[PDB]
Amino acid sequence: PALKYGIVLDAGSSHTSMFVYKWPADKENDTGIVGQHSSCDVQGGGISSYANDPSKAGQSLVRCLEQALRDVPRDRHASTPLYLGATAGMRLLNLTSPEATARVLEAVTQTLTQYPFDFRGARILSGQDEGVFGWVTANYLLENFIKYGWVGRWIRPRKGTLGAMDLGGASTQITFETTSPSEDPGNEVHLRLYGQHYRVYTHSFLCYGRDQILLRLLASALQIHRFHPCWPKGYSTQVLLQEVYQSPCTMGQSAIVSLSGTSNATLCRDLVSRLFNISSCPFSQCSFNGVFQPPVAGNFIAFSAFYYTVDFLTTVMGLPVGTLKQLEEATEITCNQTWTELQARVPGQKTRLADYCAVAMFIHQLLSRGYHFDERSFREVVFQKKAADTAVGWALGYMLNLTNLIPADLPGLRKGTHF
């Protein structure tokens, strides 16, 4: 059939990626119909890394945009919407300097507006937006919003949805369908998709993203130990304190200090447990830091750094992660490697290598102590980054919303036969 296109730039804290989506022009309202056509990863940091040089943020996008000009056929350029949405890197810069933030949005805007696409704006997503649009992505791709059954015999309970857990660079999101009463309006989400109501919980923990957790652990390690128990014995580095303390995430804790690893799983576990304040709950029950959260229920997909970390544990370390107990053993085993041990298991590039013990430990604690998974509910979590050929993230659901492609109700209401 005739095909339509749309483009999303996911301007995250640590990277920008460009996704081109495509769909049939006359069957564009079907769930699962939109899928990924192509993508491009911008080189270097995310747009917020250019706060002191905002025109470089715009120019960073140029190669991917040239690829978009080749990927979308010329005759459709002018009618292809293009959107940029930015996450916790831009949220954190907006705490630091609303002016620098606005100059970075202005530079990316000026670059984008001179391409021939229907450029529809650069915006900073709220934490709720980022969590919910990821849940829409996952569930749309896997066709969970289809009403299964036939007239006189609908499946009951209605088809379950898949919960979403996103471990980004600067924040982490959890979002799931719940039957529990809502006790905090900032967590409450009601969706009308294809004639049905989904009652959803969402929360974004700013500063609980992977790179921000590593910075807090580094600060905390320097304060309490003057060595890093999560780092492998024999690894060390020259740490620039200004970088540690400038983040809004750490500055609540002279120029260069040497820091070495000790391969101490038990002390690493204790350093990480300080990240989670479970000391009080103004609600009937909480995740952590006083945040309302109903009991986790149903299947979940854990993507982005959940996936990258688990893939290292399984593929590189050779260790199972099928139960929380296995995940915990995998983490101890990893944390107890010397730097020479660890490097010997990775023959290719070592960037990130010293950090897997800390991130795995954070992940095990986040799921068990923070979100209150147990062995029974954890069984229903899968680690994946792709569904039906499309990368899992908030970009697709953002696109679907802004291009108005998921209807609140089916046309003519399917003659009321779903009532």
Ligand SMILES: Nc1nc2c(ncn2[C@@H]2O[C@H](COP(=O)(O)OP(=O)(O)NP(=O)(O)O)[C@@H](O)[C@H]2O)c(=O)[nH]1
């Ligand atoms: N181990 C590993 N980490 C990766 C890989 N690719 C990206 N990362 C890291 O994993 C974390 C998550 O990446 P990503 O989801 O792209 O983050 P983001 O969208 O830029 N951040 P945010 O959503 O918080 O604004 C970051 O700290 C990033 O650097 C990979 O292949 N392996």
Ligand SMILES: [Mg+2]
């Ligand atoms: Mg992200």
